[PDB]
From Swiss-Prot:
This is C-X-C chemokine receptor type 1. Belongs to the G-protein coupled receptor 1 family. The chain holds residues 29 to 324 of 350 of the full protein. The lineage of its organism: Eukaryota, Metazoa, Chordata, Craniata, Vertebrata. Its main location: membrane. Interacts with IL8. Interacts with GNAI2. Receptor to interleukin-8, which is a powerful neutrophils chemotactic factor. Binding of IL-8 to the receptor causes activation of neutrophils. This response is mediated via a G-protein that activates a phosphatidylinositol-calcium second messenger system. Residues 69-83, 147-171, 237-257 are extracellular. One of its GO terms (molecular function) is interleukin-8 binding. Disulfide bonds join C82-C159. It is found in: Cell membrane. GO terms for biological process: calcium-mediated signaling; cell surface receptor signaling pathway; dendritic cell chemotaxis; G protein-coupled receptor signaling pathway; immune response; neutrophil chemotaxis; positive regulation of cytosolic calcium ion concentration; receptor internalization. The chain crosses the membrane at residues 12-38, 48-68, 84-105, 127-146, 172-192, 215-236, 258-280.
Length: 296
């Protein structure tokens, strides 16, 4: 029962406004979700995200009825607040750690140790995702135990990163290890190592076969260009006390608007794709120009 506080919860309503504002593209997502995976020419840095996206969009949407169910009834019911939203998140945090894994996994069918010996490229990566998760599970295991919380907030199953220090368990770490160190540290490291790896594969990088890797970091960084300061400054902000806190439900929920934000940024997984595609080609140049002259 988060009904402990006030009902209006003006912060949370604004998010509902977003959820419907975002739902409308969301409907595009089942269309965009299915098309790209079934689009043969859709196997870029996003292809990994598209498999995740179906899960991220499905697991989320399957759970979306629960979200209106959280406002329709008036309260919340289940363990869906952390069991779904933080749950899918944590994989999303880990996804980035894991993303290079998928890069090495997918390259492998292309360069080293291709599959087990006779198998599709896909079946492997699902199963690799399965092994990969397990190391990740151990990282996510603390929360099932005592880290973070299954505490409620407002009228929606929205979980976000950990609330306080909690040094016994270092719950503090979720903001720092999965989040900060999951993108920013390997991101710098890639940049450090990149000159090093370029030592042999300096320019050699045709198509998504190898180049994807530069792009991989770009797209995270592009995406984080926009997701980094709001999520960072939100997370810093809630933890930088003195500010928004007159109730956990609103400030813990509005902070969860961010859960849809990774859904919304995900549509870029189909825009940096045609763009990087378009970059090498040259017919694409005037193609975007084409309609622009005509406006219609």
């Amino acid at each position: 029962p988060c009904m402990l506080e006030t009902e209006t919860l003006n912060k949370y309503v604004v998010i509902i406004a977003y959820a419907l504002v975002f739902l409308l593209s969301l409907l595009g997502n089942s269309l965009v979700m299915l098309v790209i995976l079934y689009s043969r020419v859709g196997r870029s840095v996003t292809d990994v995200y598209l498999l995740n996206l179906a899960l991220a969009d499905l697991l989320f949407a399957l759970t979306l009825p629960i979200w209106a169910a959280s406002k329709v009834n008036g309260w919340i019911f289940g363990t869906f607040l952390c069991k779904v939203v933080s749950l899918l998140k944590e994989v999303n945090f880990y996804s980035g750690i894991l993303l290079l894994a998928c890069i090495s996994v997918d390259r492998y069918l292309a360069i080293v140790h291709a599959t087990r010996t006779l198998t599709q490229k896909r079946h492997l990566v699902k199963f690799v995702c399965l092994g990969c998760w397990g190391l990740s599970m151990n990282l996510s295991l603390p929360f099932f135990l005592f880290r973070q919380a299954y505490h409620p907030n407002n009228s929606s199953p929205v979980c976000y990163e950990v609330l306080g220090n909690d040094t016994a368990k270092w719950r503090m770490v979720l903001r720092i290890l999965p989040h900060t160190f999951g993108f920013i540290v390997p991101l710098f490291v890639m940049l450090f190592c990149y000159g090093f790896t370029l030592r042999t594969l300096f320019k050699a990088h045709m198509g998504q076969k190898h180049r994807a890797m530069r792009v991989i970091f770009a797209v995270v960084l592009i995406f984080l260009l926009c997701w980094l300061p709001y999520n960072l400054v939100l997370l810093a902000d809630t933890l930088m006390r003195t500010q928004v806190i007159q109730e956990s439900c609103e400030r813990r929920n509005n902070i969860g608007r961010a859960l849809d934000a990774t859904e919304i940024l995900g549509f870029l997984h189909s825009c940096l794709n045609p763009i990087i595609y378009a970059f090498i080609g040259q017919n694409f140049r005037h193609g975007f120009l084409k309609i622009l002259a005509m406006h219609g």
